[PDB]
């Protein structure tokens, strides 16, 4: 039951960064990350 | 800055397409 469907183009997930003048947020933890990059 | 010659040109076969990000999209980005 698949059919085309036509929608608005999604701009990514809306999220609201918390401010406020004493906090702040220290990384706990970390990874490592490989990144695949290709040119000719 | 401005984004009629327009209806002229589509009487010769001139053609403008629309791009895929709108004006306000770009203003989200």
Redesign the interface.
């Known amino acids: 039951s698949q059919s085309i469907i036509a929608y608005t183009m999604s701009l990514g997930a809306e999220n609201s960064v918390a401010y406020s003048n004493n906090s702040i947020a220290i990384p706990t933890n970390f990874t490592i990350s490989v990144t695949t990059e290709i040119l000719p | 800055v401005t984004l009629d010659l327009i209806c002229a040109q589509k009487f010769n076969g001139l053609t403008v397409l629309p791009p895929?990000?709108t004006d306000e999209?770009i203003a989200?980005?």
Do not use: A, P, S, T
């Open positions: 895929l990000l999209m989200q980005y």
